[PDB]
Design a binder for this molecule. Sequence first.
Ligand SMILES: Nc1nc2c(ncn2[C@@H]2O[C@H](COP(=O)(O)OP(=O)(O)O)[C@@H](O)[C@H]2O)c(=O)[nH]1
Lengths: 69, 420
Amino acid sequence: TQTLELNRMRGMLEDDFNRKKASIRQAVKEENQQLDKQKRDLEKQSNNEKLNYERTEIDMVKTRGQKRP
Amino acid sequence: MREIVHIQGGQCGNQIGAKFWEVISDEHGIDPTGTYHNVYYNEATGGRYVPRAILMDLEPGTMDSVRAGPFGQLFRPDNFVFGQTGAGNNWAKGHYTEGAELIDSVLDVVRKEAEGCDCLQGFQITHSLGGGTGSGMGTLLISKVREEYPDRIMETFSVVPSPKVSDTVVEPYNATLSVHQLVENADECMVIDNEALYDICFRTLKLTTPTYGDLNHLVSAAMSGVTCCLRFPGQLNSDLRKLAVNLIPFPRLHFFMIGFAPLTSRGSQQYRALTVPELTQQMFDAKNMMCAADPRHGRYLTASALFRGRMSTKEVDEQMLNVQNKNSSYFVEWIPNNIKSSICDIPPKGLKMAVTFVGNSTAIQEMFKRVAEQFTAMFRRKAFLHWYTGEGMDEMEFTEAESNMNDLVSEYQQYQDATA
Ligand SMILES: Nc1nc2c(ncn2[C@@H]2O[C@H](COP(=O)(O)OP(=O)(O)O)[C@@H](O)[C@H]2O)c(=O)[nH]1
């Protein structure tokens, strides 16, 4: 009975340790998923901003007609 | 009565010592606060039990690492004498320059611990053979104390270079410089290797994630079981000197292999029984020992087995007789009853049986063969020498050291064959 009381100790401790480590790994996976959104969004913002700026530049250039004094 | 001084050294020595005091505490029922809830500890006014030890290293970082872990409060704040500059794994750093300027105070405090006892039976060292700090300061302290106390005994629980991979690429040089002075002034060189402990904690326990804590715990169990038949009653008691005579037949062939039993995983623990047969089979199991040398490829000059637990004795004797009359070829025959037994009356906390096996065999001569091989290779090319001569040491010593090593193995193999 004592050796069973102790083997269940070992078993419970190990089947808790492993679940804890797997939880840590899942948390790291979530952290990387989160980090991905930064490079997903900053690039979108910079793309839209380049679009706006270069469109405004095209406009300002094209807005040169004739003077006719 | 029959105390033990605990000299440490090197980071490995310090870690193993911390774990060893942990095991002795939760066996003697000393909680890490230092109370009880003479062989090792020392009574201290206020109701404390300060463990008689001493910790030396050229880095005061190991200080904080060992005081950080539990059971660190046991060690008194005074024994932590540590050097500053660090040896950086250079034998001369930890044996000539930093040695001759701190080993003075080391000897002073060691003597203070010594006279404080009534019968200091023997010493006890925990260190390494690789690092400059460990190996160097350890062999120097051992030479000093054996010039100090020619009556006492010596013992070093030394870790050696693993065969497959090496920790510090200059391992052969520090190893041979430690063995050239250890073989002369030391009686019980308990050799250990990290690869054997790796294979033990994986194969025989299925533990997939071993850490140096667990390996140090295993070597702690071995070191404890070595002497546990002394501080406890027993139908047949021994000590740290009956071993020495039952173990060394000669002034040199005194380098012991170590083994422990029983050890089993979670799965195989429900099935296997637990009786003197199984303990014996794990005892003489090849891989169960903690040495990177399968003893089956040599013989034993002798071997002792300290059991633990209130059990029978006819089983003990008849199984010694069986394991000696069946594995007679792997034993040596020019000696009669080449095994020795000892029995105690207390198994470790949590079981009802235990075995600590010690073997003076001729199978580590292969390890010394490989060390001498590495030395010759890295020496004919003078590799990594300007560190070992830029600090007041000539190559001459080195050469003769290897010579000594040769003579060592030149003995072992010899007695393997000679008969009468
Ligand atoms: N089994 C075991 N071996 C260790 C441990 N720590 C260090 N070792 C060994 O210690 C050896 C280095 O010797 P050491 O004197 O401690 O290095 P130093 O402090 O730089 O002089 C290396 O081969 C390590 O593998 C440990 O915690 N457990």
